[PDB]
Design a protein around this ligand. Structure first.
Ligand code: ZN
Length: 134
């Protein structure tokens, strides 16, 4: 048959996507972490920041830490592809702008308004139409 790495094979494919090439916050080209809560791909820098928030999200390195199928699939079915958009529902290049990716205070104060405040928080359950329009 074939052997090399279990699960990891599916991971390298996730962080490989063109919508993951960069971080979720600092948009740094080269993510080394993944949020189990949001289901996105962050880096060591952000990974640590997110925790500071409350409640503290869940982050796990990509190479420093391993993952299981139940997890991989969860991250694959999510990915920054839709995740981001779902968090940027209201966000509009015109409505607002993007901070800098050098200072933590800036990335933090912003990340909060996305999670702590959930300003541009627009889930799909409602975004799309269905048999139940609350
Ligand atoms: Zn980052």
């Amino acid at each position: 048959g074939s052997s090399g790495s279990s699960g990891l094979k599916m991971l390298r494919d996730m962080t490989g996507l063109p919508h993951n090439r960069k971080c979720f916050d600092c948009d740094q080209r080269g993510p080394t972490y993944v949020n189990m809560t949001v289901g996105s791909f962050v880096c060591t820098s952000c990974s640590g920041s997110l925790r500071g928030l409350n409640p503290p999200h869940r982050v796990k390195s990509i190479s420093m830490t391993t993952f299981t199928q139940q997890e991989i699939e969860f991250l694959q079915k999510h990915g920054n592809e839709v995740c981001k958009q779902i968090w940027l529902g209201l966000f509009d290049d015109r409505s607002s702008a993007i901070p800098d990716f050098r200072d933590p205070q800036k990335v933090k104060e912003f990340l909060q308004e996305k999670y702590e405040k959930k300003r541009w928080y627009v889930p799909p359950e409602q975004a799309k139409s269905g048999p139940s329009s609350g």
